[PDB]
Amino acid sequence: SIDSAVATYEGFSIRVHKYADGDANVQKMRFDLLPAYVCFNPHMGGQFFGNP
């Protein structure tokens, strides 16, 4: 019962919901995304710097 749409950018998909409170006269919008992460093997990357 809430108006949506879903739009791609950089090949990531994003919902918007548009609702409102009726007793207060306000209108509200939200934009969401859920990421999932993995680290397979911590020994395969790191940080680097120059050598003095």
Q: In the complex, which residues of this chain contact its own copies (CB under 8 A)?
A: 1-3, 17-20, 22-23, 25, 27-30
CB of 39 to its own copies, least distance (A): 28
First-to-last alpha carbon distance for the chain, in angstroms, is: 63
31 vs 40, which CB is nearer to its own copies? Answer: 31
CA–CA gap between residue 43 and residue 30 (Å, rounded): 39
CB of 7 to its own copies, least distance (A): 17
10 vs 23, which CB is nearer to its own copies? Answer: 23
Give the torsion sign (CA, 41, 45, 46, 51). positive
